[PDB]
Write a protein that binds this ligand. Structure first.
Ligand SMILES: Nc1ncnc2c(CN3C[C@H](CSc4cnccn4)[C@@H](O)C3)c[nH]c12
Ligand SMILES: Nc1ncnc2c(CN3C[C@H](CSc4cnccn4)[C@@H](O)C3)c[nH]c12
Lengths: 230, 230
């Protein structure tokens, strides 16, 4: 009855999700994505990785809604930390997201702003509150804050400082804003969950390669614990 | 029978299109866009502006295909020139497009490249050849070349030089690559047509404000002349 879309960006972000749910899936190709459709605890779960970045994630989210009729979207994967209290493996949910690389300042628009839109995109308060409930019950830390998304891998102190000063972001990645954006356009509740893989600095490539697997698994496991209470 | 999607980014890019076709339209809202559906010369034409930038244009193109079933997409609007021979009001069609702001160089990927994708996206050779045919019949100039798209308005000599050296782009805008990308994923022929509004330099804001209306109309008129031969 209930249909839940579950997204990662990279194949590595959904491999643990498919394993952890542990049910059979049917593969359905559409728009260059493969959607894994299964039944888990009397819900239909549609799992896919978008591929990296904003165009890829916008397309896949739109397909999930328009073609598969999902009623909620939960995103799971990894992110770069922009704040000292978010360390490798730590979890956060995005309260709001921003497209940090949007620049129409030539027309005196604030950075991140596009006409007929807004700088910040909201996610589901209800899903975020569920996440918080669960993390307290499991005795694990969970931050809530702003996630910045853009089409560059961030690995420089200069760009971190910009994201912190301009948007007060807590983490950076490349898909969350686009997924939340599409969901809000269609009135679909959305939760964006990330586990820290790196510190978005000059060492980020190294850290990301080291921690992608573990951080993705941490996010996946948490996402499943959310689905278990929906 | 035949269904043709017609896109602009800004309302100003489609105002002349609706006027020039000169038929009645029904308005259908979906995903935060308004789609104008009409019949012209025994074709169904679905006209919309996406709103600015890559997420907006990806969403709208995806909706056109998945929700409205369009069989071809023609994009019309304005662009910044990166080459001396493309002057204000001149027309070009994109032979290929690139997302110029994509940077995964931290993992030794070439600029513009995303794993499981490609730097350059192709458009319909057939539609481009039609455009060329028509422009010769009308005795108007039409260039064919690479268009670079990203989520920044380009207005600096440094960024122009980069687009020319890195991608050999002839023009810059903020939507074309995303529209062509979605179309290719779904096997839908796509043509991206632009009229020059500015030179993508420090004076670009000024020039754009001056020439948006005329350049949009020039593009719209040409697009209609294409539809008249489909
Ligand atoms: N510092 C950071 N900046 C921007 N994004 C991130 C992320 C999250 N994901 C990982 C991946 C990096 S690109 C990639 C990965 N592997 C191969 C090629 N490209 C992209 O999907 C966004 C983690 N840390 C980040
Ligand atoms: N130099 C350039 N760089 C990048 N893009 C362009 C374009 C084409 N369009 C116009 C518009 C500019 S932003 C906008 C316009 N008006 C108000 C707010 N933002 C965006 O839709 C892309 C023309 N010249 C360009």
């Amino acid at each position: 009855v209930q249909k839940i879309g579950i997204l990662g960006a990279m194949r590595e972000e959904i491999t643990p999700i498919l394993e952890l749910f542990g049910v059979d899936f049917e593969e359905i190709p559409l728009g260059g994505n493969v959607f894994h459709k299964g039944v888990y605890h009397n819900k239909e779960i549609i799992v896919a990785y978008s591929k990296i970045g904003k165009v890829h994630s916008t397309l896949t989210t739109t397909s999930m809604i328009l073609a598969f009729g999902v009623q909620k979207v939960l995103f799971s994967g990894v992110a770069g930390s922009l704040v000292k209290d978010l360390k490798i493996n730590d979890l956060l949910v995005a309260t709001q997201l921003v497209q940090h690389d949007v620049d129409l300042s030539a027309f005196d628009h604030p950075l991140g702003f596009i006409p007929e839109s807004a700088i910040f995109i909201e996610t589901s308060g209800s899903l975020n509150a569920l996440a918080k409930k669960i993390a307290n019950e499991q005795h694990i830390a969970l931050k809530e804050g702003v996630i910045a998304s853009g089409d560059q891998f961030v690995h420089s102190k200069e760009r971190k400082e910009f994201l912190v000063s301009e948007f007060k972001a807590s983490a950076v990645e490349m898909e969350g804003a686009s997924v939340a954006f599409v969901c809000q356009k269609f009135g679909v509740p959305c939760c964006v969950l990330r586990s820290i893989s790196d510190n978005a600095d000059e060492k980020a490539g190294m850290s990301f390669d080291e921690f992608l697997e573990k951080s993705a698994h941490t996010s996946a496991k948490f996402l499943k614990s959310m689905v278990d209470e929906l």
